[PDB]
Amino acid sequence: ESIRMVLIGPPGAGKGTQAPNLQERFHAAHLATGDMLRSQIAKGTQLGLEAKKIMDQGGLVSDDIMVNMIKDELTNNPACKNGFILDGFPRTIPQAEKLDQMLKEQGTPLEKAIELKVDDELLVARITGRLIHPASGRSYHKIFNPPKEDMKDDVTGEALVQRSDDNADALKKRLAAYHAQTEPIVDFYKKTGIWAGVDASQPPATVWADILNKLGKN
Numbered sequence: 001e002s003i004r005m006v007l008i009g010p011p012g013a014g015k016g017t018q019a020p021n022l023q024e025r026f027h028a029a030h031l032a033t034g035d036m037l038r039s040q041i042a043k044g045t046q047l048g049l050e051a052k053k054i055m056d057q058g059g060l061v062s063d064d065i066m067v068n069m070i071k072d073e074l075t076n077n078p079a080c081k082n083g084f085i086l087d088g089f090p091r092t093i094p095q096a097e098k099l100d101q102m103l104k105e106q107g108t109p110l111e112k113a114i115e116l117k118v119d120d121e122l123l124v125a126r127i128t129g130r131l132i133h134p135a136s137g138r139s140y141h142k143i144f145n146p147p148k149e150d151m152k153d154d155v156t157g158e159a160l161v162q163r164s165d166d167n168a169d170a171l172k173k174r175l176a177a178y179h180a181q182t183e184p185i186v187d188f189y190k191k192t193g194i195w196a197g198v199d200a201s202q203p204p205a206t207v208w209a210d211i212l213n214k215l216g217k218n
């Protein structure tokens with residue numbers, strides 16, 4: 001009834017689609033560094049405006065900023081006492097090493113790192129057709145996962161938007177950055193013994209059953 005885990009995958013693999021499932025099943029805090037940055041943007045803060053430029057170019061925000069953000073949420077957020085799902089963090093080796101140290105000092109080490117494996121060619125179609133409900137994070141897909149009431153949140157009525165970093169230009173840079181900087185983290189968790197791989201090219205419900213299976217709960 002408690003999990004401390006990391007969700008790793010390329011842009012469009014299905015992290016934001018699966019994290020609700022995990023958060024419902026294990027009652028864990030969902031810590032998504034992308035959503036945290038996007039809330040800074042919506043508040044119009046200075047960190048938000050600087051991060052927006054970097055995100056829209058397909059680059060990565062500084063390790064120092066990202067490590068500080070997570071450290072404060074782990075320390076000051078009460079829901080993180082029940083367990084947590086890290087989504088989009090760590091994203092570089094330095095972030096992974098600093099997380100390892102943090103958790104060692106708190107005495108709450110990671111149990112699992114789930115890699116969502118899916119080929120790049122599929123990811124373009126997923127990113128191109130995405131619509132998000134900006135007031136929650138709810139992602140839909142024009143073809144693959146439609147709003148029943150078009151361009152509207154099926155369960156909350158409000159309009160869906162396109163993310164500003166979801167275009168072919170930014171996406172090419174986001175994929176290259178994933179392969180260069182993030183994918184090395186997978187070997188880090190293989191060596192520590194907590195890695196499990198999942199076929200993320202399957203449909204959502206199939207991927208969710210695969211994840212439950214890989215976690216050792218079901």
Ligand SMILES: Nc1ncnc2c1ncn2[C@@H]1O[C@H](COP(=O)(O)OP(=O)(O)OP(=O)(O)OP(=O)(O)OP(=O)(O)OC[C@H]2O[C@@H](n3cnc4c(N)ncnc43)[C@H](O)[C@@H]2O)[C@@H](O)[C@H]1O
Nearest residue numbers: 011012013014015016017033034061088126130139140141
């Ligand atoms: N730690 C960090 N350090 C540095 N910089 C950081 C950082 N964290 C964040 N940043 C920065 O902030 C930016 C954004 O980060 P972030 O917002 O975390 O984005 P990302 O990692 O690029 O991931 P996505 O949100 O694009 O993908 P997803 O897998 O969650 O997709 P979804 O489930 O919607 O699915 C995609 C689409 O396909 C669909 N779909 C999902 N699953 C399936 C399926 N199985 N079959 C068919 N359709 C499916 C969905 O409906 C949707 O349409 C970064 O690029 C960087 O600038």
